[PDB]
């Protein structure tokens, strides 16, 4: 089974450096050229760099030239991307991809990606505030002011999922993220059923269980 | 650089139908080096077609690519539920550039949103900020307008919103919008409302609360 696995993504302060890695398995790694491609939040794909099968030729997008270096270690089935002088606009999911065997350097196998966030914000766990229920009723939790992504949200430890919507976070002007999670339920269940939103923010080791009830 | 322009931006169809996606290059693509990729939410892209018309291994024959020079087409002849996704074209003949993508979404009947408004909690107000949240639940099509009003003053530029991916079961969208004020401003006004405009509503619907009531 041909597979690529990227790692090394994290938070980096502007101006600093990070190295990504990509582990290959299931094919003869030393016979293939390899690409990095990236995708900023909400945007399309942008090619970053290519490297020849044997590490000889390397080429770069104008947006990264002089700052990024692509390299490989064929003895370890591993591809690297050294990123220096990082800027906010380098924030993205970074994918490695194999060069295909038909004519030209198209991308025939992709990894799952690794996330790089360039920001001066400090790691911070969320505040979790109730969205209290005012037929069908709606209730939820507002997961506010955390950094970096991601948070995960479940309801009643996973046993409540029908009618749950957990929304994409937004990045506020503070540099912190905010997200809401809601559920619709019968009006008649409000006095009788318990609703608890379970929030986990692994980067800060913050876990919260919040019961949401009519005010 | 070779700019690839995809069209349409969004295609709304139903399973069983035929989809035609187009890609136009600003300069002629060398050696027919034109590829198509599929991307589902949370997933990496997957190669579908390369060399303008060659299917990748494992890709079913309902996908076919055609075209030459500056004009290329991806045809999906009989859509399956797994085919609703974003599609990117790419040229790999002069550097490596991508189109901006076409979203292929499920067309379903119009569904108006259920609308809910939530005041800031007392816990949050102790911290100096007030978030007011409006939920638009399970609506279609995606185009919707949320207008926040505070004592009937139309708010502009002090809110943020986001939308879920189309639901895999009922093919609807939901939207959340947050209006942010200082605690001091929040406590200066009474009536907080979100007014929602959507094709499914014969006239805009407003949900509101009065602060401290």
């Amino acid at each position: 089974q041909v597979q690529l696995v990227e790692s090394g993504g994290g938070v980096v302060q502007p101006g600093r450096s990070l190295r990504l890695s990509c582990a290959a398995s299931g094919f003869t790694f030393s016979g293939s050229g390899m690409h990095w491609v990236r995708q900023a939040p909400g945007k399309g794909l942008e090619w970053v760099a290519i490297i020849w099968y044997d590490g000889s030729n390397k080429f770069y997008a104008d947006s990264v030239k002089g700052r990024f270096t692509i390299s490989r270690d064929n003895s370890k089935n591993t591809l690297y991307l050294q990123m220096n002088s990082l800027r906010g606009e380098d924030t993205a999911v970074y994918y490695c991809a194999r060069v295909g065997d038909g004519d030209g350097n198209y991308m025939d196998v992709w990894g799952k990606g690794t996330t790089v966030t360039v920001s001066s914000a400090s790691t911070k766990g969320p505040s979790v505030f109730p969205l209290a229920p005012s037929g069908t009723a709606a209730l939820g939790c507002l997961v506010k002011d955390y950094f970096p992504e991601p948070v995960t949200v479940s309801w009643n430890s996973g046993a409540l999922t029908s009618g749950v919507h957990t929304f994409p976070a937004v990045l506020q002007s503070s540099g912190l993220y905010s997200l809401s999670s809601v559920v619709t339920v019968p009006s008649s269940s409000l006095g009788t059923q318990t609703y608890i939103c379970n929030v986990n923010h692994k980067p800060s080791n913050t876990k919260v269980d919040k019961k949401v009830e009519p005010k | 650089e070779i700019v690839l322009t995809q069209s349409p931006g969004t295609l709304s169809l139903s399973p069983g139908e035929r989809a035609t996606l187009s890609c136009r290059a600003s300069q002629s693509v060398s050696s027919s080096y034109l590829a198509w990729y599929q991307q589902k939410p949370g997933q990496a892209p997957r190669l579908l077609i390369y060399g303008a018309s060659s299917r990748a291994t494992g890709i079913p024959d309902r996908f076919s690519g055609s075209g030459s020079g500056t004009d290329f087409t991806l045809t999906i002849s009989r859509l399956e539920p797994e085919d609703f996704a974003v599609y990117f074209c790419q040229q790999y003949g002069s550097s490596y550039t991508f189109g901006q993508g076409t979203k292929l979404e499920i067309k379903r009947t119009v569904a108006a949103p259920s609308v809910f408004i939530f005041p800031p909690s007392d816990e949050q107000l102790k911290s100096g900020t007030a978030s007011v949240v409006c939920l638009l639940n399970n609506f279609y099509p995606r185009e919707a307008k949320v207008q926040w009003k505070v004592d009937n003053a139309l708010q502009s530029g002090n809110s943020q919103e986001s939308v879920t991916e189309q639901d895999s079961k009922d093919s609807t969208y939901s939207l959340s919008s947050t209006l942010t004020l200082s605690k001091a401003d929040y406590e200066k006004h009474k009536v907080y409302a979100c007014e929602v405009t959507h094709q499914g509503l014969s006239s805009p619907v407003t949900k509101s609360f009065n602060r401290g009531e």
Partner: peptide
């Protein structure tokens, strides 16, 4: 040299 030339060993 050519960034689009064959990057594979064969």
């Amino acid at each position: 040299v050519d960034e689009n030339a064959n990057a594979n060993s064969a």
